[PDB]
Design a protein around this nucleic acid. Structure first.
Ligand SMILES: Nc1nc2[nH]cnc2c(=O)[nH]1
Ligand SMILES: [Mg+2]
Ligand SMILES: [Mg+2]
Ligand SMILES: [Mg+2]
Ligand SMILES: [Mg+2]
Ligand SMILES: [Mg+2]
Ligand SMILES: [Mg+2]
Ligand SMILES: [Mg+2]
Ligand SMILES: [Mg+2]
Ligand SMILES: [Mg+2]
Ligand SMILES: [Mg+2]
Ligand SMILES: [Mg+2]
Ligand SMILES: [Mg+2]
Ligand SMILES: [Mg+2]
Ligand SMILES: [Mg+2]
Ligand SMILES: [Mg+2]
Ligand SMILES: [Mg+2]
Ligand SMILES: [Mg+2]
Ligand SMILES: [Mg+2]
Ligand SMILES: [Mg+2]
Ligand SMILES: [Mg+2]
Ligand SMILES: [Mg+2]
Ligand SMILES: [Mg+2]
Ligand SMILES: [Mg+2]
Ligand SMILES: [Mg+2]
Ligand SMILES: [Mg+2]
Ligand SMILES: [Mg+2]
Ligand SMILES: [Mg+2]
Ligand SMILES: [Mg+2]
Ligand SMILES: [Mg+2]
Ligand SMILES: [Mg+2]
Ligand SMILES: [Mg+2]
Ligand SMILES: [Mg+2]
Ligand SMILES: [Mg+2]
Ligand SMILES: [Mg+2]
Ligand SMILES: [Mg+2]
Ligand SMILES: [Mg+2]
Ligand SMILES: [Mg+2]
Ligand SMILES: [Mg+2]
Ligand SMILES: [Mg+2]
Ligand SMILES: [Mg+2]
Ligand SMILES: [Mg+2]
Ligand SMILES: [Mg+2]
Ligand SMILES: [Mg+2]
Ligand SMILES: [Mg+2]
Ligand SMILES: [Mg+2]
Lengths: 114, 56, 125, 123, 209
RNA sequence: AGGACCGAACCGACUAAUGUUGAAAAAUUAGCGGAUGACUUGUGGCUGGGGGUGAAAGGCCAAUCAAACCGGGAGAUAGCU
RNA sequence: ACACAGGUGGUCAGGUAGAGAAUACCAAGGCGCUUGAGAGAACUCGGGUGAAGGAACUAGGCAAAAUGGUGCCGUAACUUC
RNA sequence: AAUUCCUUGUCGGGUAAGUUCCGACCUGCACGAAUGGCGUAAUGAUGGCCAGGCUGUCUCCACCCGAGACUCAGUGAAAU
RNA sequence: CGAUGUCGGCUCAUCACAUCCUGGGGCUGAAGUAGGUCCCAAGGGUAUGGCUGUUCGCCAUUUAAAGUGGUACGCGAGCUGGGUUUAGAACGUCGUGAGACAGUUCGGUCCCUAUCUGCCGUGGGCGCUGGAGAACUGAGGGGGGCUGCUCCUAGUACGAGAGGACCGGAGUGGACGCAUCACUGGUGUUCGGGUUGUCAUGCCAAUGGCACUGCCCGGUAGCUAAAUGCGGAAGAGAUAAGUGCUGAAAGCAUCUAAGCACGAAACUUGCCCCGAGAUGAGUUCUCCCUGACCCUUUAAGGGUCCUGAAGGAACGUUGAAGACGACGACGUUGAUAGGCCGGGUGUGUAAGCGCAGCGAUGCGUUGAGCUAACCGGUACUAAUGAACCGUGAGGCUUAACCU
C-alpha cells in the first residue's frame, strides 16, 4: 500500500493537463509504422474518465467513416505522448455513454465558455 | 427414502455421542456488588467491572 | 461469499432495515439508553454516531440532512442543541454497548446501548 | 468476439453487405474470432452486380469488432460494429479491391498487407 | 538453491520505456533469519529453517521462545524449511535477504489461495448447467448423474462433487522476476500469485525453464 | 343494430413455474378466453338407479358412476392366494 | 376434519392522478397475517442487472425479453363489400 | 393428402446444409360427391412452416436482492 | 408379475482395446510430399450445425482426429417427456356391428424430507506409553500428461518436372487446467444523481414514505470472465514392437543359447497437492512438572489430603477463514472491530443567499455538497484482574557407557 503507493507515484506523469468529460481532446500516441516510429493523432470526445492514480484512464470517442471508434487510454502509459484540449464541452454527467445512440447533429455538445 | 431396517438403540446412542451440553465455566463475581455474572456481561442489578452502570 | 463486506442483513430487506434503524436511532437519542439484540446494537452505532458527528456543526444544511436521516425534529433538535455540544471534543465513540441477558421468549442475546456521558435527567424527560 | 450466427458488415467493395459467420476457423471447439482471425461465412445480402452473390459460401478476415483489441500498455480500441473483408476460399486473399472504414495494425501480416494499404485509416 | 518467505502486498504495474505494461505482484521479503540448520548426521537430511517478521512476545509460547533463543534470533511470525543442495551451506542466526533472487530469472510462488467456502460443482469443477427452462424441475446447477447402475452399484472415489474450494496450498510456476530491491524489502514478479493481500508466500527459484 | 370490437367486476380455464407427507383430496403466481348473451347469478321447485339428466365427454346424479348410496338375501360363490 | 392462501348471494362508493368500479398513492376504518434470534455456504424457490454474440437452445422460441396511451398523417393481397 | 405402405417418392423453391414446410407431378398400397366433393372472406388460448423485433433459450455463465437451506431457543411429525 | 419404469436427449461419467488422432516400428506395387497394410502402444485428446422424437443416417462447415465397444442396449428416489401401452377425436383400411390396425393424425398429471452402503467436504474422540509446542522425514494416495500452424535448416535431400522432406532448432495459437483482480469490463436493492404519480413533514423552499430498488443514468470495495499470469515439458531409469554387435549349439549361417548396444505420448521417476491412524502411529529442536497419608484381596491396586505447570481451552473484539465445528489476527505492555481525522473514489456544481428573467429556469458563490465494504492515521467505545481442562518426574527386560 505505502509500498505500492510509492511504486506507483514514481511512475506517474507530472504534467497531465486538466480535461473533463465532454471536452474535445487530441491525444498524440507513439506508434510503430511498419519500420518507422512516429506520433499519430487521435482526436475525439472524452466520454469517460477513470481517476485511479497510476491506473487512471479515459475513453475518447470519434467518428471514422460513418462509424464510431472508441479508444481507452491508460493516462500514464509512455505510449501516450501528450494530451491537449481542443474545445471545452458542457455536460452534466461524468459518463457520456448516451452519445453512443446519437449521431451527427444529435451528438453535438455545447461549449463551456467560462 | 426411508430405512429398510430399524436402527438400534445402540446406534441412536452413538448418534447422540456429541449432544451433551457444556457447563458454563466462566462466571465471575462483581467486586463491588458481589453478584455472579457471565464474563463481559453486566450483573442483574446492573453492575459491571465494579461500577453501577445501569440504574435497574 | 462475503469478503470485505459490511452491513448486517438482519433477515430484512433494505428499506425495512433503514426504517428500523431510523426509529431505533431516535429511541437512543431520546432516551439515551435502550436495550435491543446485540447485533442490532452493534449495527446501530454506525447510524447514531454519524448523526452525532454531524450535529457537531450547527447549520441549516446539517439540520436538514439530519432531518432527512431521522425525520423527527425533536431528535434533530436534541442532536444539535444537546448532543453536539456534549460530544464537541470527543473523537468518536459516543455510544457504549453493555451486554446483558438472553431474552426469555426466544433466547436472543441482548445488550444495552447507551450514550457515553449519559444524562439521567434527560432520560426521565 | 464473433461466433456462429453472428452477423457482420462488410468493409470492402466485394458487393456483399451482410454476412453470417458459419464457422470460426483455426481449431477444434474454437469459440470466437476477433480482429485478424479468419471465418467461414455465408452471404445474406449482396448488391445486384458485384463479385459475389447471396448464398455464396466463403471466408473472411475480421477487421473491426465491438469487443475491440487490447494493446500492450493495457489500452483498448473498440468499434461500433463488427466488419470483415471477404477472402477467396482457397487463396485466402481479398476478393474486393478497396477497403472501407478504419482497420488495426494487428492485420500487419504478410497475408493482409494489402488490406492495411487500402484502408482509409489504420489504428 | 534455497527459497525465501515473504508477504503478498498486492498487484500493480510497471510501464516500460516502449509501451509495455507489466502486471506485477508486489512481494515483501524481509530478511529471513536462519533458526536451525539440519544435517545428515543429526537429522537425516540437509536443510535450513528460517523465520521472518516479528511476533508479539505475549503470543510467543515458551516452547517457541526456547527454540528461538537457541538460535540467537528474535521471534518471527512462523518457521519454514528450505532444502539444501550439495555445496549449499548456512549457519544458525545468519540473515538471508531478497538479493538472493538478484540473478534468478524466474521463480515459483506458493501461497494459500483465497477461500470460496463450500462450492457447488459448477464453480468448483466447471460442470455445465442443465436447462434453465424447457421443463427443468429443480435441477439447474445440480450435478446430474453420479454413477452408472447396478454395476458397479457404487460411486467411485475421486468423483467430482461439491465441497470446500480454495484456502489451500497452490504453487504457481515460472513467474518472471521483474525487480529485486533489498533496501525496500521488495520482489516484483510478473503476474498473479496465490493468496489474499497480507498472507504468507514462499518464493523459490523455478524448478523448470 | 349486432350470439359486434377493446377492456374491470362476473363467468371460464389455453401455457408455464411452484406445490405434490401441499397453504389446497385439484390450488397459488404470471400470463389467457367470454364479458348485451345460445350470458351470468340468488331463493324455491321438478326429474331417481337399467332410472334421471346430457350443445354427447360414457359426462354428471353429495370428494372413485360402463349402472349411486344405505339396509337386507349374506357366512353369495371363490377347482384361487 | 385445522384459528386451512380455497368456496360463499346482496348493499355502500371519500381525495389526487385516471376513460374507468383498471391502476398507484392516501382519507374514514381496519391491519402487520400466533414460533422467534442470528448467520449471509452449496442447492432450491421468487426477483433485479449483464460484456460480445443473438434461437447457435429445444421435440417446439417452453420460459424469458419485447410491444403496449391519445391525437393526427397513412395503410397491401383478398373479400361474402 | 388429418388418407401414400414402398417413402426422406421425384422435380422445383426456401437454407451454408430442410425426414418438417410451400408449389408441382400422378405410380390414388388404400380420395370422391349430404357416410357429402372441391373451394371459400371472416373467425380461432386449433395443427404445420417461414421472417423482423426481442432477448440468459443458448455459447457460458457472473454479480446482486429477498424466502428456505445452516446455527441457537420453544413446539414437534411422516413413510418404513 | 404382494411392480426390476421403456426409446432418445440433457447432466455426469467409468472401463476394455479389436487404436480415430498424436508416439514407435516391419513390409510396400515406399523417389520426395502423401498413402496402403501389419506390429507395438490405452498417456492424453477425440466438432458445431440443417432435417427428423430419433439412436443412426444423409447433408453443410470445421478438426490433428471427429474411434469401436462394455457399464440394467451406464445414468428418471439426477432432469426432460419429443417417440412409445390408457381414457377425447378424426382419416385411410377391415368389420353387419360393438369395435380393430404391428397405419397415420391433433390433444393428453413423471411422487418420494436419504436410515444403511457409497461418494464429496468438514469436525469431535481416543491412541501413538509423563505431558506439551513447533518444524519435518516421506511409506502410501491423488492430480497432470492433448495438439495446430508458421519460420530457420532449405526451395536444401529427393525429383524429368510439378512439388518437396527426414534429423534438429525458434516462435505463435486452439482446447483444457489453476491462480488472480493490477489492467479491460459485468455486477454492485449499503454511494451519488435525474425523473413520473401520490402522501406526508403547517406552508414556500428543502426533504422523506410508497408505487419491481417506482422507473432510470452512473458507480466504491468485494465477487467475477469475456480480463491476464502461469502450466502440460525437458531430463533420467527399465522396457514394447522393432534394429543391431559378438556367438556357438549346427566347421557356415544365426539379435540369443552365454555375453553386449539401442529402442515409444504406455511403466518407474522427474512437476503439483494430500500425506506418520505409515497402530510398522517415525525424526529433529524447544518447553513443563521435584509434598505427604490411608486401606484391602499387595499390584502397572484403590482412595484421601496438599499441588495444578508447560500448554490447551474459555470469554470478548474479530478476519480476503467459514454452513456449524475448524483455521488465522487481536484483547489496554492494545489498531481486533466500530467510531473519529485526513486522503482517495464515485457522483457531478448541495443548501442557503445574491444577481438576471413576467415565468419555467439560468448564472455566481462552486468542481459544490454527499460519499459503503477502500488507503494512511487515531485508544473515543468495546475487547476484566480472574476462574475450566491438563498434573506432581513417568513400566519391565536386555544391551552399551557411567557409578
Ligand atoms: N483477556 C485476555 N487477554 C489475552 N491476551 C492473550 N491471551 C489472552 C486471554 O486469554 N485473555
Ligand atoms: Mg429467520
Ligand atoms: Mg420499496
Ligand atoms: Mg442514503
Ligand atoms: Mg509449515
Ligand atoms: Mg472466503
Ligand atoms: Mg448447456
Ligand atoms: Mg413437477
Ligand atoms: Mg426451476
Ligand atoms: Mg436410477
Ligand atoms: Mg459389490
Ligand atoms: Mg360480444
Ligand atoms: Mg389466473
Ligand atoms: Mg373482451
Ligand atoms: Mg337449486
Ligand atoms: Mg342364500
Ligand atoms: Mg365370504
Ligand atoms: Mg393463523
Ligand atoms: Mg380462511
Ligand atoms: Mg384496486
Ligand atoms: Mg447479454
Ligand atoms: Mg449490450
Ligand atoms: Mg438482431
Ligand atoms: Mg435449431
Ligand atoms: Mg441442437
Ligand atoms: Mg411464450
Ligand atoms: Mg415479460
Ligand atoms: Mg431455421
Ligand atoms: Mg404439398
Ligand atoms: Mg370460440
Ligand atoms: Mg439468500
Ligand atoms: Mg430446533
Ligand atoms: Mg417386494
Ligand atoms: Mg493392440
Ligand atoms: Mg490383412
Ligand atoms: Mg483413452
Ligand atoms: Mg479427415
Ligand atoms: Mg439404458
Ligand atoms: Mg422426479
Ligand atoms: Mg407405432
Ligand atoms: Mg522413501
Ligand atoms: Mg414545494
Ligand atoms: Mg501433515
Ligand atoms: Mg449554479
Ligand atoms: Mg471522508
Ligand atoms: Mg505425588
Amino acid at each position: 500500500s505505502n509500498i505500492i503507493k510509492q511504486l506507483e507515484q514514481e511512475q506517474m506523469k507530472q504534467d497531465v493537463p486538466s480535461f473533463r468529460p465532454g471536452d474535445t481532446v487530441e491525444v498524440k500516441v507513439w506508434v510503430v509504422e511498419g519500420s518507422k516510429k512516429r506520433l499519430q493523432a487521435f482526436e475525439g470526445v472524452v466520454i469517460a474518465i477513470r481517476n485511479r492514480g497510476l491506473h487512471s484512464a479515459f475513453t475518447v470517442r470519434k467518428i471514422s467513416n460513418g462509424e464510431g471508434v472508441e479508444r481507452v487510454f491508460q493516462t500514464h502509459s509512455p505510449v501516450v505522448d501528450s494530451i491537449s484540449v481542443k474545445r471545452r464541452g458542457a455536460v452534466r454527467k461524468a459518463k457520456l455513454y448516451y452519445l453512443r445512440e446519437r449521431t451527427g447533429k444529435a451528438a453535438r455538445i455545447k461549449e463551456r465558455l467560462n | 427414502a426411508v430405512q429398510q431396517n430399524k436402527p438400534t438403540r445402540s446406534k441412536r446412542g452413538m448418534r447422540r455421542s456429541h449432544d451433551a451440553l457444556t457447563a458454563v465455566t466462566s462466571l465471575s463475581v462483581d467486586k463491588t456488588s458481589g453478584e455472579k455474572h457471565l464474563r463481559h456481561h453486566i450483573t442483574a442489578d446492573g453492575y459491571y467491572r465494579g461500577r453501577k452502570v445501569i440504574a435497574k | 461469499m462475503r469478503h470485505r463486506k459490511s452491513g448486517r442483513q438482519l433477515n430484512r430487506n433494505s428499506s425495512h432495515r433503514q426504517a428500523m434503524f431510523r426509529n431505533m436511532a431516535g429511541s437512543l437519542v431520546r432516551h439515551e439508553i435502550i436495550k435491543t439484540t446485540l447485533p442490532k446494537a452493534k449495527e446501530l452505532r454506525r447510524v447514531v454516531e454519524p448523526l452525532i458527528t454531524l450535529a457537531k456543526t450547527d447549520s441549516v444544511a446539517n439540520r436538514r440532512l439530519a432531518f432527512a436521516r431521522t425525520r423527527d425534529n425533536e431528535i434533530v433538535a436534541k442532536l444539535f442543541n444537546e448532543l453536539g455540544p456534549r460530544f464537541a471534543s470527543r473523537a468518536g465513540g459516543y455510544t457504549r454497548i453493555l451486554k446483558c441477558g438472553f431474552r426469555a421468549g426466544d433466547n436472543a442475546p441482548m445488550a444495552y446501548i447507551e450514550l457515553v456521558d449519559r444524562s439521567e435527567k434527560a432520560e426521565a424527560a | 468476439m464473433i461466433q456462429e450466427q453472428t452477423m457482420l458488415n462488410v468493409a470492402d467493395n466485394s458487393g456483399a453487405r451482410r454476412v453470417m459467420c458459419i464457422k470460426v476457423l483455426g481449431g477444434s471447439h474454437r469459440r470466437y474470432a476477433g480482429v485478424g482471425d479468419i471465418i467461414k461465412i455465408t452471404i445474406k445480402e449482396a448488391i445486384p452486380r458485384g463479385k459475389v452473390k447471396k448464398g455464396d459460401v466463403l471466408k473472411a478476415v475480421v477487421v473491426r469488432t465491438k469487443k475491440g483489441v487490447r494493446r500492450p500498455d493495457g489500452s483498448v480500441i473498440r468499434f461500433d460494429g463488427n466488419a470483415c473483408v471477404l477472402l477467396n476460399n482457397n487463396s485466402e486473399q481479398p476478393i474486393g479491391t478497396r477497403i472501407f472504414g478504419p482497420v488495426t495494425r494487428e492485420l500487419r501480416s504478410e497475408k493482409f498487407m494489402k488490406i492495411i494499404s487500402l484502408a482509409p485509416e489504420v489504428l | 538453491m534455497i527459497g525465501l518467505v515473504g508477504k503478498k502486498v498486492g498487484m500493480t504495474r510497471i510501464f516500460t520505456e516502449d509501451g509495455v505494461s507489466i502486471p506485477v505482484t508486489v512481494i515483501e521479503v524481509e530478511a529471513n533469519r536462519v533458526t536451525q540448520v539440519k544435517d545428515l548426521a543429526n537429522d537425516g537430511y540437509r536443510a535450513i529453517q528460517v523465520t521472518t517478521g516479528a511476533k508479539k512476545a505475549n503470543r510467543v509460547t515458551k516452547p517457541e521462545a526456547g527454540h528461538f533463543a537457541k538460535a540467537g534470533v528474535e521471534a518471527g511470525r512462523g518457521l519454514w524449511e528450505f532444502r539444501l543442495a550439495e555445496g549449499e551451506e548456512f549457519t544458525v542466526g545468519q540473515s538471508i535477504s531478497v538479493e538472493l533472487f538478484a540473478d534468478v530469472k524466474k521463480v515459483d510462488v506458493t501461497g494459500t489461495s483465497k477461500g470460496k467456502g463450500f462450492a457447488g460443482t459448477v464453480k468448483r469443477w466447471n460442470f455445465r448447467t442443465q436447462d434453465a427452462t424447457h421443463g427443468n424441475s429443480l435441477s439447474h446447477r445440480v450435478p446430474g448423474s453420479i454413477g452408472q447402475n447396478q454395476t458397479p452399484g457404487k460411486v467411485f472415489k475421486g468423483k467430482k462433487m461439491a465441497g470446500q474450494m480454495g484456502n489451500e496450498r497452490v504453487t504457481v510456476q515460472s513467474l518472471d522476476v521483474v525487480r529485486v530491491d533489498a533496501e525496500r524489502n521488495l520482489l516484483l514478479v510478473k503476474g498473479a500469485v496465490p493468496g489474499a493481500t497480507g498472507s504468507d508466500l514462499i518464493v523459490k527459484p523455478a524448478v523448470k525453464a
